Amino acid sequence: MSFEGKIALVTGASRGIGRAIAETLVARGAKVIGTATSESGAQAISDYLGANGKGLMLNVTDPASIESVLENVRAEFGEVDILVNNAGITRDNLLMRMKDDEWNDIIETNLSSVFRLSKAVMRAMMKKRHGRIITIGSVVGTMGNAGQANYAAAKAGLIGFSKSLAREVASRGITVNVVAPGFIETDMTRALTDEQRAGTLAAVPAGRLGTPNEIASAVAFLASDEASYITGETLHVNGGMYMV
Amino acid sequence: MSFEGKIALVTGASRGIGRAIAETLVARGAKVIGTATSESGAQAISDYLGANGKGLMLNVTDPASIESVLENVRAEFGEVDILVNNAGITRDNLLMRMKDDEWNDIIETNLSSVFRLSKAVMRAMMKKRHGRIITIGSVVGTMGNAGQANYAAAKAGLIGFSKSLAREVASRGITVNVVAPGFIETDMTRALTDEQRAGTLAAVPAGRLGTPNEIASAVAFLASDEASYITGETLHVNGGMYMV
Amino acid sequence: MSFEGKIALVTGASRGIGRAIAETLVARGAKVIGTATSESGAQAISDYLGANGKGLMLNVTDPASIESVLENVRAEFGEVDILVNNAGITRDNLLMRMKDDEWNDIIETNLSSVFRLSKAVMRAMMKKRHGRIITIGSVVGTMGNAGQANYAAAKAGLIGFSKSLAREVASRGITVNVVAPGFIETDMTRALTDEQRAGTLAAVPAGRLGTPNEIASAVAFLASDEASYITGETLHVNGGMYMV
Amino acid sequence: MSFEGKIALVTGASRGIGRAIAETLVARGAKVIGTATSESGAQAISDYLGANGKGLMLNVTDPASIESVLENVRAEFGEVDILVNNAGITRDNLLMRMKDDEWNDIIETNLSSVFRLSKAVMRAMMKKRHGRIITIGSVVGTMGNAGQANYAAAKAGLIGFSKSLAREVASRGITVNVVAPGFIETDMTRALTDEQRAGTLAAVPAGRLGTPNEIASAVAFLASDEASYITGETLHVNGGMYMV
Ligand SMILES: NC(=O)c1ccc[n+]([C@@H]2O[C@H](COP(=O)([O-])OP(=O)(O)OC[C@H]3O[C@@H](n4cnc5c(N)ncnc54)[C@H](OP(=O)(O)O)[C@@H]3O)[C@@H](O)[C@H]2O)c1
Ligand SMILES: NC(=O)c1ccc[n+]([C@@H]2O[C@H](COP(=O)([O-])OP(=O)(O)OC[C@H]3O[C@@H](n4cnc5c(N)ncnc54)[C@H](OP(=O)(O)O)[C@@H]3O)[C@@H](O)[C@H]2O)c1
Structure with missing residues (x-):
């Protein structure tokens, strides 16, 4: 088992991609700390993780919340070995x-x-x-993407950040990478009309949406000891929607 | 290739790249408003622009400063046709x-x-x-770049922003583009040790630093009517230091 | 911005993009040699170039044809200063x-x-x-692009070639660059169904096809003394169809 | 085991990366056909594969050799499920x-x-x-890379080819991807002076060469059912030497 003895922190682990990431790391031996923005959300994460981790309330914009969560992680489990930054929002216009x-x-x-x-x-x-x-x-x-200049700025920016950090820490055995999903099936997309779906599918050579578990598999590959020579990279998981 | 009757605003136009951009747009017929963060800096811009523009004090982090500058431009010259975002700082660590x-x-x-x-x-x-x-x-x-994760995040971010904005306004005849300099002769580079320079030149096929005027030429090309089918693009001007 | 005294060779200059490139280089002062694959095609090039150049028959797959054309150019005009490789074919499947x-x-x-x-x-x-x-x-x-794996391989290949060549000759004042058009109005595109056009325009933010002269403007910029610090680069001229 | 029941063909499997790829696919359940350009090379591949595959002589430039090898594969093992194109040469100048x-x-x-x-x-x-x-x-x-314009052309070209093929076959459950190694340890590199090594290492943030098994792990990830939503992609395995 790849992650035996490792502590992973997965921000935004309530549902969809973040939950699939948490569950996949558990299935491969990790202890997982999953976060949500509310105390009930954090409890629902604790309920699915059971004995293999815990849910905590974390607001990634608030340094006091970050410090409190990491102190809790350190007391109960130990130091973080794997950080998965999944927390993310959109506010389009x-x-x-x-x-x-x-x-x-x-x-x-x-x-x-x-x-x-x-x-x-x-x-x-x-x-x-x-x-x-x-x-x-x-x-x-x-x-x-039109109407998402804020989101595009942040998601492009985190690649520049990750490349620079990777350059600083590569020689100490730490890798820093990005997984870039395409269109992934969630609650949101399951609620759409067949016509809204059809237009999204038309942009995807694979002819289907991706699944959260497909993003989790890519994350788990990069987090493993089989990816120690991959750093500063962006792994695109999008059914051929965008080929770099 | 002529900008007669166009109004350009060039942020951070005191020296180096921003000054060369301002002077080049003047040379092609534009009226140019260059900015600095102090009233003396703005006056030095007015001195080099003379009859073909003016200098103003702008703080690009302050919305009240932005609005005051634009209202001054609108009263004296008219609406901005060409925006050149050159203002920027570094805080390396x-x-x-x-x-x-x-x-x-x-x-x-x-x-x-x-x-x-x-x-x-x-x-x-x-x-x-x-x-x-x-x-x-x-x-x-x-x-x-190691030690510049903040700067890299911002400079990568602005590309994601620019592609999204480009997509929103392309059909209305507005283009949005990025010029990415390599190592350019500036106060910054003149203040490096001979050893820091030599090591950076070793990474440049051209075997020399670029000039501010070389950046200005690329900007003036993109600002012209001869580049109306170029949008959401990044023009790399770096002597082959990085080839995309 | 002037090419007075420069000799340019533009392969495949009969029509469309290659003709627009040839005419634009003439308009900036160059002597231009344009090529076609037949003697009548070459004569049609001579007719539009008049006093500012000539047409010659060239087969770019035949080294004897290349050498014969260059020797003719050298005798009549002098050495080539600007090479524009425009010749190309498609065989889709x-x-x-x-x-x-x-x-x-x-x-x-x-x-x-x-x-x-x-x-x-x-x-x-x-x-x-x-x-x-x-x-x-x-x-x-x-x-x-589906059905064009041959064409895509060649067009991707020529970028790898160009970056390598750029690295060899950058320190001697030679630049090597690629201009990548999007969907441009040409005989090819005029021969499509209204439906094939409409679907391709839907993928272009600008909402129109590009013109040959728009490609020619980008080529003329890169060929100029104002682009001496740009090498190994790909300039995408596609109305935002693809943003790098 | 990921590849139970699958037949993989790995071209150029004598040593280094191609051998590590063959061995890794064996270790995960595949039957492997590895190729070399000579009858003795093919026998040495049969010797390391033993009961889990076979070595054959294949010249990838010769269509008669390709057809003969695939007929042999089909008679003895069955149809190819996984093709790994590792065969490659350099002729620098x-x-x-x-x-x-x-x-x-x-x-x-x-x-x-x-x-x-x-x-x-x-x-x-x-x-x-x-x-x-x-x-x-x-x-x-x-x-x-200077002196490798042929190699760079081919290696860039195969990405254009792969993107186009991926677009044709994505909807039928076939993925087409590229793994791009950086500097990898081989017999060649083990024979170098400490000074030749030091200059190569200076270009790599990780501060070491990659191993063949690191390339094999990336190949095996993409070949698995955990990468079914990754197509038309290039996975860079280079210790941060180049970050896309
Ligand atoms: N779905 C797709 O197709 C897709 C495609 C590409 C990329 N992504 C990326 O994948 C990630 C998952 O987002 P999603 O839309 O798929 O599902 P989601 O269910 O909305 O996940 C967003 C998560 O982020 C957490 N979060 C939001 N604001 C936060 C804050 N201030 N502090 C800490 N946590 C915060 C949320 O917490 P609560 O649990 O408390 O709400 C939630 O767990 C995001 O980074 C997104 O940009 C998704
Ligand atoms: N080593 C690195 O650092 C590195 C870095 C990046 C990429 N690569 C790529 O990795 C691959 C492995 O090459 P390598 O230099 O690492 O090791 P290599 O041991 O030289 O492998 C090359 C293989 O290709 C086979 N081959 C050569 N010409 C062939 C032909 N006409 N038909 C069929 N097979 C042929 C060779 O056969 P024989 O066994 O009969 O000689 C050999 O098995 C190549 O695609 C290379 O471009 C390597």
Whole structure:
């Protein structure tokens, strides 16, 4: 089992991709700490993890929340070996309608969060001479998308951040990578009309949406000892929607 | 190739790249408004622009400063046709030494500024069905660089922003593009040791530093009517240091 | 911006993009040699070039034809300063239907031709310590396209070739670059059904086809003294169809 | 075990990366057919594979050799499920010294081979509604390298080819991907002076060469059912030497 003895922190693990990531790391031997933004969300994460981890309330924009969560992780489980930055929001609008706080909230939540959490786990990874940081990107970070300039900025920015951090820590056995999903099936997409789905599918050579478990498999590959020579990279998981 | 009757605003036009951009747009017939962060800096810009423009004090992190500058431009010259986002700062540090405000100030000054300024000029461009937005990026935005994770995040971010904005306004005759310099002769590079220079030149096939005027030429090409089918693109001007 | 005293060779200059390139270089002061695959095609090129150049018959797959054309150019005009590799063909088919000669002919005509022509002009450029090589790529080289695996291979290949050549000759004042058009109005596109056009326009933010002159403007920029710090680069001119 | 019941064909499996790929696929349940260019090389492959596969003599430039090898595979094992295109050569020279046959041999061996072998296995993959094609690229295909314009052309070209093929076959459950190694330890590199090594290591943030087994792990990930939503992609395995 790949992750026996490892402690993973997966931000935004309530559902969909973040839950599939948490469950996959559990299935391969890790102890997982999954986060949500509320105390009930955190309890629902504890309920699915059971004996293989815990749910905690974390707001990745608030440094006091980050510090409190990591202290709790350290007391109960130990140091973080694997950080998976999945927490992310969208607040879409065309530029002229985009409010200052819609811009700021996305930049804080989706880009500056990657800085804060990576900084907060890095020292203990450097001491172990081994670490994994994986952030969940988006195809929109590379292509752009009308009405999502805030989101695209954050998702492109976290790649620049990750490349620079990778260059600093590569020689100490820590890799820093991004997984960029395409269109993935969630509750959201399951609620759409057949016509809304058909237009999304038309953009995907594979002819289907991706599944959360497909993103989890890519994360788990990069987090494993079989990916120790991959750093500063973006792994695109999108059914051929965008080929780099 | 002529800009007669066009109004350009070039942020951070005191020296180096921003000055060369301002002078080059003048040489092609534009009226140019260059900015600096102090009243004396703005006056030095007015001195070199003379009859073909003026200098103004602008803080690109302050919406009140942006609006005051644009209202002055609108009263004296008219609406901005060409926006060149050149203003930017660096606060280098390895991640472990990087203070929260060194992150925040770079994100605000180098990325969020591009959103605020673009938003502030866009309506008048959309009415005319013609416009240019050009932002000065960096090779670091695409490659990453140790000790500049903040700067790389902002410079990568501004590309994602620019692709998204490009997609929103392409059908109204507005293009949005990035020019990414390599190592350019500037106060910054003149202040390096001979050894820091030599090592950076070894990574440049051309075997020399670029000039500010070389960046200005690329900007002036993209700002022209001869580049109306180029949008959402990044023009790398780096002597082969990085080939995309 | 002027090419007075420069000699340019533009392969495949009968019509469309190659003609627009030839005419634009004339308009900027160059003497232009345009090529076609027949003696009547070459004469039609001579008719439009008049006093500012000539047409010649060239087969870019035949080294004897290349050498005969260059010797004619050298006798009448002088050494080539600017090479524009525009010659190219398509032989579309899904992989299972693609005949061996449909693969081979595209590779020979669209990729190996760029090697032979570049090699044939390079020595005189190196002696002068000044030169331009510009090859016309395609968006398909970066994105791929079903039914054009041969064409995509050649157009992607020529970029790898161009980056390698750029690295060899950058320090001698020669740049080597690619211009990658999107969907441009040409005989090809005029011969499509209204439905094939409409579907391709839906993928273009600009909402229109590009013109040959738009490609020519980008080529003329790169061929100029104002682009001496741009090498190994790909300039995408596609109305936002693909944003790198 | 991931590959139980699968037949993999790994071209160029004598040593280094191709051998590590063959051995890794064996270790995960596949029957492997590994190739070499001589009858003794093929026998040495049979010796290491033992009961889990066979060695055969294959020249990927010769269609009669391709057909004979695939007929042998089909009679003894069955249809190919996984094709790994590892066969590759270099014949380096600066452009002016590069002979026509040095160009042609690399294009035939490293690019056209990918077309021929992919075409030869595709029909049976389409019938199974499941398939993997993985080609071994190189960082040089994306960066370029002086003295390797032939190699860079071929390695860039095979990405264009792979993207186009992926677009044709994505909806039938076949993925087509590239693994791009950086600097990998081989017999060659083990024979170098400490000074030659030191210069190579200086370009690699990880501070070490990659191992053949690291490339094999990436191949095996893409060949598995855990990578069914990854197609048309390039996975860079280079210790941060090049970050895309
Ligand atoms: N779905 C797709 O097709 C797709 C495609 C590409 C990329 N992505 C990326 O995948 C990730 C998952 O998002 P999603 O839309 O798929 O599903 P989601 O269920 O909305 O997940 C978002 C998660 O982020 C957490 N979160 C939000 N704001 C936060 C904050 N301030 N602090 C900490 N956690 C916060 C949420 O917490 P609660 O549990 O408390 O709400 C939730 O767990 C995001 O990074 C997204 O950008 C998704
Ligand atoms: N080593 C690195 O650092 C590195 C880096 C990036 C990419 N690569 C790529 O990895 C692959 C392995 O090459 P290598 O240099 O690492 O080791 P290598 O041991 O030289 O492998 C090359 C293999 O290709 C086979 N081959 C050569 N010409 C052939 C032909 N005409 N038909 C069929 N097979 C042929 C050889 O056969 P024989 O066994 O009969 O000689 C040999 O098995 C190549 O695609 C290479 O471009 C390697």
